[PDB]
């Protein structure tokens, strides 16, 4: 009801997150994968979509969009074209490493999720798009896919369900932008990973011009367990619209950086202390945290003493549980330099298609590089803020939002530090 | 009907579904700012300059890409919209180079105009701008890429309109660069139009660079004569000189583009130019004289001769007024050997019926056709805009193209049915596989390039094509209002001469060698001094001293198509007239005026004294020649085929080869093209 | 480095390159993963395969990929320039890639980069004179909890320290390949001090079903 | 007690493509 | 002698029906009997049908065919040809 966290291992979906249990089909079956999958498949797509809806699962990728609603867009009557389920395994957000573990220690969860989600959407195949860097993880993924094919779980008739499904693994190259829906679709199609215009939406025209639904690795991998254990069980955890269990990557200045699974809406302090040991030098030596990935703005220690790791809670705090990649900084950190590095990341990773981001992320990068040294003057902070607001709502894709938000968080919570550094520079 | 109601600042407007916000605003009258959007190209949405605010909506949409919805109120003067435009313009101008004084887009710059109107008046960018390296892209297009705004109109035009797939965006981020990754050359018959579509000055013309500013130039409206398409063009003139040639929008012909030759051959007008009457070739070498002397000598010779001993040749760039003047003069002399350089089969119905030698389906009907059969022709290098229309149809309205000739790159997929003229009889009799496609075709076309007709078996080729066309009509059951048979011309004056009744081909001249030849812009070299008697007394009447001029006993300088008001008919029968841009150089005179003055100096005086009276004579001869921009239909192709059946000839087994087999042959075709310097550079670059 | 190609004696439109027969079999396998037609989708995997065979993508390799997939060569140039794992200039035998984004920089990737460049006697972005090592700075490579971190070719070495990085560089310098994964004594992504989550046996196949 | 995901310590450079080629037999006829 | 015949007619007007059906009927049998004599059939919209005939030294004589019938047009053509 109230007060969240302390998830029991009975309720943890990913039971091999740490890799000390066999990840191949032999161990996956022991841990409970591929159980009653034939029954789940034969119960129909409407039942599966209803389960996902009543579970309250929200997209575990960047932005949290109700998974049941998003997947129902492809439940429309057939138009005579094939339907595809593209899995977004291009974990590019800085600070995020959860998809890597789901794929290298529990590929069969992802594979069965592909099967059930493809049945729900009516898809015939499911292309998995995995970073080019994640070579060993893609290799494990194909070993698991081949195990499934050889065991008959996929292919002609999956699990005897009479449903024809194929799982393709497609490796990308170096491009954070290729995690975007339409950019990912274009990369699969072989062109440059440049986001398309919307509308039309992927559910109407997608990969190869046919209907498509892009889903996160975590979102697809949670689905079989939701179906098996009931949507109500999943909804039991979390507050209200923020339901489920989430993988948290606590990194930065923390004693024991780790990937852990915890209840949705677990307090940030509980998450950082119970599992990660605590911020380096004690809770007092805490300056700011980036609850999301890199596209999320900062929250200072004052706001992070009581914030709850939730979509709604972090939106209220003026940030957002993007990918739940807690990055911790401990006072000794150079906050403006760190945020400048993040803006440099966005400058490097911008596709360059559309003018706002193309020509404005470089502007922000230059201004932030000057700020790190204090070369600018105090009147330029508002200029940076205005540039950020100009970039925010005018880009083709959300990467512009992600590049604008960290700067806004810095200007909103650490303006005095910027002024102090500028004054010290002017003192020379 | 299936129309939706949308509001533009509360102004209700009816728009069909799929209409975008930009087009709704345009219907009301508002012209949303834009850069990346073009009407003839795919929507891109890169620039984001067209951002507008939809009422009671959180974020601003892209007017060019957003499809409108019922009840939407589009606010175009709102704070949010204006601030979005200001921000987008600021981002566009951040990295732009301060080249306005030395930029060819001086007073025509959309970036300048939209910065003045919708942008801010000051810059707060306090950093160092980027600097891209320029790249060599051929002798026709200058690349100053530091000015590029990455709008991609050039890329889209090359990919779609020209179908070349050479330009693209390389890299990513602020370092994205538009161009060929390698040291390619962007050579194509439509490459020039990239200059127009580039909203900024990143792509400009090497020949025209730095020469003038837009506010100085005077924009005349004339027609192109480098081919039989009749591309409407705008001639930019500064102080009695041609500064550059630009396209003029004609949805039924041009569609905003013009061929590279049409664009860049205007240089030839300022070289190897006949600028004074010149006579005395019998006494040795040609020497200048005066009009009243040269015309006196010509009139003396004409009075001495009569009958078929005098004959005339019209070639290439000639106008209907001059043609009718010369025809009337020779008729009054009692001659009918007035021929034209380009052959046309005259065995069947010949020139009796206009449906026998016109693109009856018009350029714009290709979009309405289902199947196209290109017989012995290379549309890309003759009628390049006709090829552009074919590609547009193929790309959009699912079209099928087949070719009965040499296999050449046409910029679109096509079936190579073989390069034999017996395939025509095969298709007519049903022995070929293409009849399977012709069966389900609903709106067929059978274009027959005149280059094929100029073989020695042109009569057989035309007879076979018409006989196939009749069977195509009967099997396909096409209505009587859809003309399938078409003939694609490559010479500007061919259609007008045929309408006026000039004998096609210069065969009668060889049959009865004249004692006084009258070359009227006849630089084709069909008839040389080796033919004719030993003292023919040839008379050249043209603008350029090329093949014709050296062989002559007198030269009478005429006007070029940029200096005279002339009537030119294109390959589809449309009659168009040019306008006087420059004035003739020196003592040059209009060709019809020269003919009439020669007449009056001679005993025989013609019954016109003004351009309008010559036009009335044209009305008397062929009425359609005076209806400008109106395509009169035609009939009695059944009669044409009936008469063609009786013709007894066989198709020679030689392959059907197009004369312009490669791009290198496109840049030299007319006297002006041969005398142009830029065309020589293009030829050399292609050959290299 | 540069997004414009200038021919030289090496990296020339005629410089030798072609897939081996087994590589052609692999190419067919890749192409058959997409609908009929739509084979241009394999440009990315095919180009990566060409790089895996050679070591870098010369203009001849790009043209060969474009020819075998039947796409305009510019459609391959765009891909090769757009994506960052495609090497358009020759690269050392072992390609070292030190992550530098904020999550690693906070855990002292600067020291790792400094130690690597000092040991190899090169500056970030340069090749060792032996043509054995190439050091570059890369954005997030995933695995931000095992920071600081580097990638040698297709392997992740993570939880690194200056001593560990110079030791795994000594092994590559001499012979053998160091075993990938964290070098901090914790297997991967788990809490260092000790487990705080999945510390009890996982439940049976049918535990909790509706 | 002991890490289990060790099979990736022996993958060569062509492991991914070899697995894809092997799966080519199971893959279902394309549209 | 005669050098040309030029038949001007409207594409689809009541006053040119006779000429238009004369073309369909007797044109072939005339062009196959006077093979060397041009007979230029030129049409223009909303034109007044008129037969043009040019003789020796550029002397052209004109008639009218407006609201005339097929047989009348044929008679006029025969008279000009003879
Ligand atoms: C620049 C950018 C980079 C991204 N990277 C990822 C990723 O690794 N995973 C992911 O699920 N979504 C990513 N996204 C978000 C995707 O576009 C999309 O929202 C997500 O894949 C949908 O998955 P979901 O419905 O389960 O939430 C990115 C978006 C942007 C704009
Ligand atoms: S916001 Fe940036 S990354 Fe996204 S489409 Fe525009 S230029 Fe590309
Ligand atoms: S395109 Fe030329 S004229 Fe226009 S703003 Fe840029 S430099 Fe100035
Ligand atoms: S060169 Fe010109 S047309 Fe091409 S992208 Fe740049 S600004 Fe647009
Ligand atoms: S004109 Fe609409 S974004 Fe460019
Ligand atoms: S920040 Fe270095 S691995 Fe992500």
Quick one: angle between helices A45-55 and A107-121, nearest 10?
Answer: 120
Question: In this structure, which ligand is nearest to the CA of B119?
Answer: 3
Distance from CA of A392 to the nearest CA of B (A): 10
Q: Name, in order, each residue with C-beta under 8 angstroms of B436's C-beta and a sequence gap of 6 or more.
A: none
Query: Which residue do the tokens 């803020």 mark?
Result: A385
Q: Please say whether the beta carbons of B80 and A392 come within 8 A.
A: no
Task: Please give the distance of CA A214 from its chain centroid, rounded to a whole number.
Answer: 12
Q: Which residues of C are less than 8 Å from D10 in CB distance?
A: none
Residues in chain C: 210
The Cβ of residue B541 has, within 10 Å, a number of other Cβ atoms equal to 28
Ligand 5: distance of its center to the CA of B419 in Å?
46
Please answer yes or no on whether A294 and C101 come within 8 Å at the CB atom: yes
Neighboring chains of E (3 or more beta-carbon pairs < 8 A): B
Beta bridge partners of B7: B12, B73
Query: Which residue do the tokens 């975590």 mark?
Result: A218
Ligand 5: distance of its center to the CA of A297 in Å?
29
Cα–Cα distances (Å) from A187 to A61, A133, B128, B207, C46, in that order, read 18, 15, 33, 41, 13
Question: In this structure, which ligand is nearest to the CA of B201?
Answer: 3
Q: Do residues C85 and C99 share a domain?
A: no
Q: Name, in order, each residue with C-beta under 8 angstroms of A428's C-beta and a sequence gap of 6 or more.
A: none
Q: Do residues B381 and B323 share a domain?
A: no
A251 CB within 8 Å of a chain D CB = no
Q: Please say whether the beta carbons of B235 and B241 come within 8 A.
A: no
* Cα A360 to Cα A347: distance, rounded to the nearest angstrom: 9
* Cα A28 to Cα A111: distance, rounded to the nearest angstrom: 11
Q: Do residues C61 and C96 share a domain?
A: no
A106 CB within 8 Å of a chain C CB = no
What are the domain boundaries of chain E?
1-82
B622 CB within 8 Å of a chain E CB = yes
Q: Please say whether the beta carbons of A332 and A285 come within 8 A.
A: yes
Closest by CA position to A336, among listed A234, A250, A415: A415
What are phi and psi for residue E31, nearest 5 degrees?
-75, -20
Please answer yes or no on whether C197 and A192 come within 8 Å at the CB atom: no
Q: Do residues B680 and B625 share a domain?
A: no
Closest by CA position to B243, among listed B394, B45, B104: B104
For residue B231 the two structure tokens come to 């591309």
Q: Do residues B661 and B627 share a domain?
A: no
Q: Name, in order, each residue with C-beta under 8 angstroms of A143's C-beta and a sequence gap of 6 or more.
A: A24, A107, D7, D19
Q: Do residues B118 and B53 share a domain?
A: yes
Handedness of CA B367, B368, B369, B375 (dihedral sign): negative
Whole-angstrom Cα Rg for chain C: 21
Give CA torsion, residues A154, A159, A161, A167, to 10 deg: -10
Q: Do residues C168 and C124 share a domain?
A: yes
Q: Name, in order, each residue with C-beta under 8 angstroms of B481's C-beta and a sequence gap of 6 or more.
A: none
Please answer yes or no on whether C82 and B170 come within 8 Å at the CB atom: yes
Q: Do residues C136 and C171 share a domain?
A: yes
The residue to mutate among B89, B94, B105, having the most atoms of ligand 3 within 8 angstroms of its beta carbon, is B105
Instruction: Characterise B209 by phi-psi region: left (phi > 0), alpha (psi -120 to 50), beta (else).
Output: beta
Specify the number of domains making up chain C. Answer: 2
Interface test with B, best of A394, A396, A404 (most B CBs within 10 A): A394
Note the maximum CA span of chain C. 69
Using CB atoms, which residue from C7, C13, C77 is nearest to B168? C77
Domain A334-428 CATH (choose: 3.30.428.10, 1.20.1440.230, 3.40.1010.10, 2.40.50.140):
1.20.1440.230
Please answer yes or no on whether C192 and A256 come within 8 Å at the CB atom: yes
Verify whether ligand 4 is closer than 6 Å to residue B132 (CB atom).
no
Task: Please give the distance of CA A365 from its chain centroid, rounded to a whole number.
Answer: 24
Ligand 4: distance of its center to the CA of B110 in Å?
13
By CB neighbour count within 10 A (0-12 exposed, 13-18 middle, 19+ buried), where does B108 fall?
middle
| DSSP letter (8 states) at residue B93 | H
Q: Do residues B458 and B335 share a domain?
A: no
Ligand 4: distance of its center to the CA of B156 in Å?
10
How many angstroms separate the first and last alpha carbons of chain E?
10
Q: Do residues C37 and C81 share a domain?
A: yes
Q: Is residue C12 part of a domain?
A: no
* Cα B576 to Cα B224: distance, rounded to the nearest angstrom: 10
Q: Do residues B72 and B173 share a domain?
A: yes
Q: Do residues C102 and C43 share a domain?
A: no
Q: Do residues C85 and C95 share a domain?
A: no
Residue ranges of chain A that CATH labels 1.20.1440.230: 334-428
Whole-angstrom Cα Rg for chain A: 22
Q: In what side-by-side order are the strands of the sheet with B232-237?
A: B218-223, B232-237, B242-247
Query: Which residue do the tokens 């449906």 mark?
Result: B355
3-state secondary structure chain A: CCCCCCCCCCCCCCCCCCCCCCCCHHHHHHHCCCCCHHHHHHCCHHHHHHHHHHHCCECCCCCCCEHHHHHHCCCCCCCCCCCEEEEEECCCCCCCCHHHHHHHHCHHHHHHHHHHHHHHHCCCEEEEEECCCCHHHHHHHHHHHHHHHHHCCCECCHHHCCCCEEEEEEECCCCHHHHCHHHHHHHHHCCCCCCCCCCCCCCCCCHHHCCEEEEEHHHHHHHHHHHHHCHHHHHCCECCCCECEEEEEEEECECCCEEEEEECCCEHHHHHHHHCCCECCCCCCCCEEECCCCCCCCEEHHHHCCCECCHHHHHHCCCCCCCCCCEEECCCCCHHHHHHHHHHHHHHHCCCCCHHHHHHHHHHHHHHHHHHHCCCCCCHHHHHHHHHHHHHCCCCCCHHHHHHHHHHHHHHHCHHHHHHHHHHHHCC
Q: Do residues B510 and B367 share a domain?
A: no
Q: Which residues of C are less than 8 Å from D30 in CB distance?
A: 32, 34-36
Residue of B nearest to E36 (CA): B347
* Cα A129 to Cα E12: distance, rounded to the nearest angstrom: 66
Domain containing B659: what range?
343-490+633-666
Q: Please say whether the beta carbons of D1 and C10 come within 8 A.
A: no
Nearest CA to ligand 2 atom 4: A397
Last residue of a domain, one of C47, C73, C90: C90
Q: Do residues B535 and B467 share a domain?
A: no
Query: Which residue do the tokens 């009054």 mark?
Result: B332
Using CB atoms, which residue from B83, B92, B172 is nearest to A351? B172
Q: Which residues of A are less than 8 Å from C34 in CB distance?
A: 208
* Cα C16 to Cα A141: distance, rounded to the nearest angstrom: 35
How many angstroms separate the first and last alpha carbons of chain A?
58
What are phi and psi for residue C144, nearest 5 degrees?
-80, -10
Chains D and C, touching by 3 or more CB pairs within 8 angstroms: yes
For residue C110 the two structure tokens come to 């600067």
What residues 186-205 of chain C have any CB closer than 8 A to a CB of chain D? 187-188
Question: In this structure, which ligand is nearest to the CA of A220?
Answer: 1
For residue B58 the two structure tokens come to 């959180």
Last residue of a domain, one of C34, C64, C90: C90
Give exposure, B544-577, as e/b (b: 16+ Cβ within 10 Å). bbbbbbebbbbbbbbbbbbbbbbbbbbbbbbbbb
Query: Which residue do the tokens 């797939």 mark?
Result: B165
For residue B390 the two structure tokens come to 């074919």
Give CA torsion, residues A384, A388, A390, A393, to 10 deg: -170
Among the residues of chain C, which ranges form H helices?
21-31, 43-54, 59-69, 73-82, 102-105, 109-120, 162-174
Interface test with D, best of A14, A17, A28, A135 (most D CBs within 10 A): A135
For residue C48 the two structure tokens come to 């990566």
Verify whether ligand 1 is closer than 6 Å to residue A93 (CB atom).
yes
Q: Which residues of B are less than 8 Å from E28 in CB distance?
A: 639, 642-643
Domain containing C65: what range?
17-90
Last residue of a domain, one of C68, C90, C112: C90
Topology classification of domain E1-82: Glutaredoxin (3.40.30)
Neighboring chains of C (3 or more beta-carbon pairs < 8 A): A, B, D
B168 CB within 8 Å of a chain C CB = yes
* Domain covering A57-236: architecture: 3-Layer(aba) Sandwich (3.40)
Residue of C nearest to A351 (CA): C82
Instruction: Report the SS3 class of residue D24.
Output: coil
By CB neighbour count within 10 A (0-12 exposed, 13-18 middle, 19+ buried), where does B610 fall?
exposed
- Atom from ligand 5 closest to the CA of residue B65: 2
Q: Do residues C34 and C59 share a domain?
A: yes
Q: Please say whether the beta carbons of B519 and B539 come within 8 A.
A: yes
Q: Name, in order, each residue with C-beta under 8 angstroms of C67's C-beta and a sequence gap of 6 or more.
A: none
Q: Please say whether the beta carbons of B114 and B36 come within 8 A.
A: no
* C99 labeled part of a ligand binding site: yes
* Cα B323 to Cα B337: distance, rounded to the nearest angstrom: 13
Residue of B nearest to C11 (CA): B182
Handedness of CA B26, B29, B32, B36 (dihedral sign): positive
* Cα B168 to Cα A131: distance, rounded to the nearest angstrom: 25
Q: Do residues B331 and B379 share a domain?
A: no
Domain over A237-333 is classified CATH 3.10.20.600: yes
Handedness of CA B595, B599, B600, B606 (dihedral sign): negative
By CB neighbour count within 10 A (0-12 exposed, 13-18 middle, 19+ buried), where does B440 fall?
exposed
Q: Do residues C131 and C110 share a domain?
A: yes
Assess whether the previous peptide bond of C148 is cis (omega < 30° from 0).
yes
Q: Please say whether the beta carbons of A10 and A237 come within 8 A.
A: no
What residues 107-136 of chain B have any CB closer than 8 A to a CB of chain C? 133, 135
B629 CB within 8 Å of a chain E CB = no
Chains D and E, touching by 3 or more CB pairs within 8 angstroms: no
Question: In this structure, which ligand is nearest to the CA of C98?
Answer: 6
Q: Please say whether the beta carbons of B554 and B281 come within 8 A.
A: yes
Ligand 1: distance of its center to the CA of A322 in Å?
9
Please answer yes or no on whether B173 and A354 come within 8 Å at the CB atom: no
- Cα A331–Cα A332–Cα A334 angle in degrees, nearest 5: 95
B63 CB within 8 Å of a chain A CB = no
Q: Do residues B265 and B286 share a domain?
A: no
What residues 1-31 of chain D have any CB closer than 8 A to a CB of chain A? 1-5, 7-8, 11, 15-16, 19-20, 22-23, 26-28, 31
Q: Please say whether the beta carbons of B554 and B539 come within 8 A.
A: yes
Resolution attained, angstroms: 3.2
**Secondary structure tally for chain D: helices H, strands E:** 1, 0
* Cα A299 to Cα A283: distance, rounded to the nearest angstrom: 15
Using CB atoms, which residue from D5, D11, D30 is nearest to C36? D30
Q: Please say whether the beta carbons of A102 and A69 come within 8 A.
A: no
């Amino acid at each position: 009801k109230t007060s969240f966290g302390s998830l029991k291992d009975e309720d943890r979906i990913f039971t091999n997150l740490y890799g000390r249990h066999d990840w191949r089909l032999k161990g996956a079956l022991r841990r409970g994968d591929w159980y009653k999958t034939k029954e789940i498949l034969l119960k129909g797509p409407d039942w599966i979509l209803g389960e996902m809806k009543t579970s309250g699962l929200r997209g575990r990728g960047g932005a949290g969009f109700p998974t049941g609603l998003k997947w129902s867009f492809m439940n429309k009557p057939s138009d005579g074209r094939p339907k595809y389920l593209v899995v977004n395994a291009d974990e590019g957000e800085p600070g995020t490493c959860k998809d890597r573990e789901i794929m290298r220690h529990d590929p069969h969860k992802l594979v069965e999720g592909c099967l059930v989600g493809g049945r729900a959407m009516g898809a015939r195949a499911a292309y998995i798009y995995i970073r080019g860097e994640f070579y060993n993880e893609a290799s494990n993924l194909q070993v698991a896919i081949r195990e499934a094919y050889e065991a008959g779980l996929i292919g002609k008739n999956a699990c005897g369900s009479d449903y024809d499904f194929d799982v393709f693994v497609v490796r990308g190259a170096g491009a954070y932008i290729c995690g975007e829906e339409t950019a990912l679709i274009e990369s699969i199609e072989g062109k440059q990973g440049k986001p398309r215009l919307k509308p039309p939406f992927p559910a109407d025209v997608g990969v190869f011009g046919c209907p498509t639904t892009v889903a996160n690795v975590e979102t697809v991998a949670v689905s079989p367990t939701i179906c098996r254990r009931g949507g109500t069980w999943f909804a039991g955890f979390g507050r209200e619209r923020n339901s489920g269990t989430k993988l948290f990557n606590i990194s930065g200045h923390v004693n024991h950086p780790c990937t852990v699974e915890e209840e949705m809406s677990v307090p940030l302090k509980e998450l950082i202390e119970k599992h990660a040991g605590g911020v380096t030098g004690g809770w007092d030596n805490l300056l700011a945290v980036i609850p999301g990935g890199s596209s999320t703005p900062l929250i200072p220690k004052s706001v992070c003493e009581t914030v709850l790791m939730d979509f709604d809670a972090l939106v209220q705090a003026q940030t957002g549980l993007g990918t739940a990649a807690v990055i911790v900084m401990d006072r000794s950190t150079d906050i403006v330099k760190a945020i400048a590095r993040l803006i440099e990341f966005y400058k490097h990773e911008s596709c360059g298609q559309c003018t706002p981001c193309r020509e404005g992320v470089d502007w922000m990068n230059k201004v932030m590089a000057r700020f790190v040294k204090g070369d600018a003057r105090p009147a330029e902070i508002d200029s940076l803020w205005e540039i950020s607001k100009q970039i925010e709502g005018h880009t083709i894709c959300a990467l512009g939002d992600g590049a604008a938000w960290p700067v806004q968080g810095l200007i909103r919570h650490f303006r005095p530090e910027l002024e102090d550094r500028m004054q010290r520079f002017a003192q020379q | 009907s299936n129309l939706i109601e949308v509001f533009v600042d509360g102004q209700s407007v009816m728009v069909e579904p799929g209409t975008t916000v930009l087009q709704a605003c345009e219907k009301v009258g508002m012209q949303i700012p834009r850069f990346c959007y073009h009407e003839r190209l795919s929507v891109a949405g890169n620039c984001r300059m067209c951002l507008v605010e939809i009422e009671k909506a959180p974020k601003v949409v892209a007017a060019c890409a957003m499809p409108v919805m019922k009840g939407w109120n589009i606010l175009t003067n709102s704070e949010k919209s204006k601030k979005a435009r200001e921000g987008v313009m600021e981002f566009l101008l951040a990295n732009h180079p301060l080249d306005c004084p030395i930029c060819d887009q001086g007073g025509e710059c959309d970036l300048q105009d939209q910065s003045m109107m919708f942008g801010s008046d000051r810059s707060r960018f306090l950093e160092g701008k980027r600097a891209v390296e320029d790249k060599n892209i051929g002798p026709l297009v200058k690349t100053i890429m530091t000015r590029c705004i990455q709008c991609t109109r050039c890329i889209r035009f090359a990919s779609e309109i020209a179908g070349v797939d050479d330009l693209g965006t390389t890299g990513r981020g602020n370092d994205m660069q538009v161009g060929t990754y390698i040291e390619k050359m962007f050579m194509s018959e439509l490459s020039g139009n990239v200059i127009d579509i580039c909203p900024v000055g990143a792509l400009t013309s090497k020949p025209y660079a730095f020469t003038a500013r837009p506010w100085e130039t005077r924009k005349t409206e004339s027609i192109d004569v480098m081919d039989a398409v009749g591309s409407n063009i705008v001639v930019s003139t500064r102080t009695g000189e041609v500064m550059r040639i630009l396209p003029r929008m004609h949805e039924d012909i041009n569609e905003e583009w013009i061929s590279d030759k049409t664009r860049f051959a205007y240089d030839g007008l300022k070289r190897q130019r006949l600028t004074e009457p010149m006579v005395r070739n019998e006494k040795g070498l040609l020497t200048y004289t005066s009009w009243e002397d040269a015309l006196s000598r010509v009139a003396g010779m004409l009075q001495n001769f009569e009958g078929n001993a005098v004959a005339a040749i019209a070639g290439g760039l000639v106008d209907a007024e001059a043609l009718v003047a010369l025809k009337d003069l020779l008729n009054k002399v009692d001659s009918d050997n007035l021929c034209t350089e380009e052959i046309f089969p005259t065995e069947g119905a010949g020139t009796d019926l206009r449906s026998n030698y016109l693109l009856n389906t018009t350029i714009a009907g290709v979009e309405e056709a289902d199947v196209v059969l290109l017989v012995g022709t290379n549309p890309r290098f003759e009628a390049p805009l006709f090829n552009a229309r074919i590609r547009k149809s193929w790309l959009h309205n699912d079209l099928k193209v087949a070719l009965i000739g040499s296999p050449v790159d046409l910029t679109y997929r096509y079936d190579h049915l073989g390069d034999s003229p017996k395939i025509l009889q095969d298709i007519a009799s049903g022995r070929h596989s293409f009849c399977e496609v012709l069966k389900d075709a609903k709106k067929p076309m059978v274009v027959l390039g005149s280059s094929a007709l100029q073989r020695d078996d042109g009569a057989a080729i035309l007879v076979a094509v018409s006989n196939m066309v009749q069977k195509i009509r009967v099997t396909t059951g096409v209505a009587a209002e859809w003309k399938v048979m078409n003939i694609l011309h490559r010479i500007a004056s061919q259609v007008a001469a045929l309408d006026l009744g000039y004998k096609p081909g210069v065969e009668a001249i060889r049959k009865n060698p004249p004692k006084m030849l009258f070359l009227l812009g006849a630089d084709g070299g069909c008839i040389t001094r080796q033919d004719l008697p030993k003292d023919c007394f040839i008379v050249y009447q043209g603008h350029h001293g090329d093949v014709g001029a050296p062989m002559a006993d007198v030269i009478l300088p005429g006007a070029a198509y940029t200096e005279k008001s002339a009537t030119y008919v294109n390959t589809e029968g449309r009659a168009q007239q040019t306008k006087v841009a420059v004035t003739p150089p020196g003592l040059a005179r209009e060709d019809w005026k020269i003919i009439r003055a020669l007449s009056e100096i001679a005993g025989i005086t013609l019954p016109y004294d003004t351009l309008d009276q010559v036009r009335n004579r044209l009305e008397e001869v062929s009425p359609n020649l005076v209806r400008y921009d109106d395509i009169e239909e035609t009939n009695y192709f059944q009669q044409a085929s009936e008469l063609a059946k009786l013709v007894n000839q066989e198709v020679l087994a030689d392959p059907l080869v197009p004369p312009q087999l490669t791009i290198k042959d496109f840049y030299m075709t007319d006297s002006i093209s041969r005398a142009s310097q830029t065309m020589a550079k293009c030829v050399k670059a292609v050959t290299e | 480095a540069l997004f414009v190609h200038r021919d030289t004696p090496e990296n020339n439109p005629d410089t030798p390159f072609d897939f081996t027969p087994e590589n052609y079999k692999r190419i067919e396998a890749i192409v058959k993963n997409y609908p009929e037609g739509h084979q241009a989708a394999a440009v990315l995997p095919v180009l990566d395969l060409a790089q895996r065979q050679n070591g870098w993508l010369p203009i001849s390799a790009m043209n060969k990929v474009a020819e075998v997939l039947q796409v305009p060569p510019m459609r391959v140039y765009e891909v090769a320039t757009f994506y960052t794992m495609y090497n358009r200039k020759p690269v050392g035998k072992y390609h070292i890639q030190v992550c530098t984004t904020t999550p690693c920089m906070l855990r002292d990737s600067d020291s790792i980069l400094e130690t690597l460049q000092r040991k190899l006697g090169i500056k970030v972005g340069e090749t060792t004179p032996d043509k054995l090592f190439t050091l570059i700075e890369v954005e997030c490579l995933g695995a931000c909890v095992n920071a600081p971190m580097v990638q040698i070719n297709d392997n992740y070495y993570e939880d690194l320290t200056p001593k560990d990085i110079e030791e795994i560089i000594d092994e590559l310098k001499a012979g053998k390949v160091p075993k990938p994964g964290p070098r901090s004594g914790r297997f991967c992504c788990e809490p260092a001090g000790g487990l705080t989550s999945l510390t009890e046996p996982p439940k049976g196949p049918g535990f909790g079903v509706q | 007690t002991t890490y289990k995901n060790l099979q990736h310590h022996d993958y060569n450079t062509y492991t991914f493509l070899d697995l894809n080629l092997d799966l080519s037999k199971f893959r279902l006829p394309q549209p | 002698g005669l050098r040309e015949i030029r038949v001007h007619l409207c594409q689809r007007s009541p006053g040119s029906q006779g000429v238009r059906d004369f073309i369909v009927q007797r044109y072939v049998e005339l062009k196959k009997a006077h093979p060397n004599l041009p007979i230029l059939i030129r049409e223009c919209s909303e034109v007044q049908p008129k037969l043009w005939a040019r003789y020796a030294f550029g002397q052209e004589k004109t008639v009218s065919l407006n609201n005339l019938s097929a047989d009348e047009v044929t008679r006029a053509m025969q008279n000009v040809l003879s």
